[PDB]
Each structure stands twice: as structure tokens, then as C-alpha cells.
């Protein structure tokens, strides 16, 4: 149930069970890609010749110990070049200030570590960690009210979250909403969108 050494960017960090079954709960991060037979490969940009290449490779545990993966907070030049040559870079689980040429792959994203549960809460860098995990456990127990307004603040993923939930109806190939009733939505798509025979 401890912090898995090769699970830095595979499991949800603060999202885990808050009861007797603690640790048994985990979640893949925002850019967590899977492996071939039974594993997962965390996406990771290439870092070659200063320029932190946008080429992102889904990275599994075994090969990760070879290449040097930079930290997310990477101030890189417009060409991608690392602004600071002495940059704390992790290659095999020991991040240390590594030369601009000492990082083999570039990170994915700052949020590429935690799961969607953490994503809703912003300014989290100013938060207490035990309180953070307790709250992330707490967030699940809400239920819809009579009136739904988005909270004043935002974290940026709420619209995407609403999209991904799949509770709303997507205008799957639609052009214009014509006769929408209290339950009867008649929507006409353009002739180009109106598939032939449709």
C-alpha cells in the first residue's frame, strides 16, 4: 500500500480509498496509455538536443529507468530548448539537476500525474496533503440539487468532464435544431451532413 516506486505517473496519486481498503484504489492519469500484453505506458514527450520534442512516447516502467524524463515544470525555449541547462532530470527514479543534454525524454504534462478527481480542485499547490486526499475522497458523495450553477471558480476541465460523462446528448452529426420539444427534439442536419439516404 506504499508509494509504488515505478508508479510515479501511472496511478492517481491522492485518489485512493479512505477506509480499511486504502491503497487498493488508484486511477490512471490524464495521459495514461496502455501497453501490449497487460501493462500501461505513460505518455512522455521526447527530449533531444535541448529541444523538448513534442513527440510523446507512451512510457512503461521497464524502459523508463533508462531514458531521462524531465520534470513537468520545464521552461523550454520556443525551439523547445531548455532555458536552464542545469535542470533536475529523472532517469531512473533519482531526479537531479541534469544538463540540458542529460534528459532523454520530455515530460507529458503537469497534470499528467494525478487523476480526474484531483483535476476539479485548482490552486492545489497551496493545500495540505492529508487534507487534500481526505477531500478527494470526500468529493464523490455529492448528488444533484434542484438548481445547478457552475461554481464561481474553474479548473478548466469541467466542460470536458461534462462531455466525457455521456449523460447529455451529443449532436451526433447535426446541423440545426428545428423542432425541440420538452422531450421531442427534431434537429435537421445540412445536406452534406444529411448522409445519403438519411
Amino acid at each position: 500500500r506504499d508509494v509504488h516506486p515505478t508508479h510515479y505517473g501511472r496511478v492517481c496519486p491522492i485518489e485512493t480509498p479512505e477506509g480499511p481498503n486504502i491503497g487498493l484504489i488508484n486511477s490512471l492519469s490524464v495521459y495514461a496509455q496502455t501497453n501490449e500484453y497487460g501493462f500501461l505506458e505513460t505518455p512522455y514527450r521526447k527530449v533531444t538536443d535541448g529541444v523538448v520534442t513534442d513527440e510523446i512516447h507512451y512510457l512503461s516502467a521497464i524502459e523508463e529507468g533508462n531514458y531521462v524524463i524531465a520534470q513537468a515544470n520545464s521552461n523550454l525555449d520556443e525551439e523547445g530548448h531548455f532555458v536552464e541547462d542545469l535542470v533536475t532530470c529523472r532517469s531512473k527514479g533519482e531526479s537531479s539537476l541534469f544538463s540540458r543534454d542529460q534528459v532523454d525524454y520530455m515530460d507529458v504534462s503537469t497534470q499528467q500525474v494525478v487523476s480526474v478527481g484531483a483535476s476539479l480542485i485548482p490552486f492545489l499547490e497551496h493545500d495540505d496533503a492529508n487534507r487534500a486526499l481526505m477531500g478527494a475522497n470526500m468529493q464523490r458523495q455529492a448528488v444533484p440539487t434542484l438548481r445547478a450553477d457552475k461554481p464561481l471558480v474553474g479548473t478548466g476541465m469541467e466542460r470536458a468532464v461534462a462531455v466525457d460523462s455521456g449523460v447529455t446528448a451529443v449532436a451526433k452529426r447535426g446541423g440545426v435544431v428545428q423542432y425541440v420539444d420538452a422531450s421531442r427534439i427534431v434537429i435537421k442536419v445540412n445536406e452534406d451532413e444529411m448522409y445519403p439516404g438519411e
Partner: peptide
């Protein structure tokens, strides 16, 4: 300020 609050399942 405008501070949010939520409800519990209990």
C-alpha cells in the same frame, strides 16, 4: 468572497 459549498450523500 464567493466560497463554494457542497452537500454530502449522508
Amino acid at each position: 468572497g464567493y466560497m463554494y459549498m457542497l452537500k454530502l450523500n449522508h
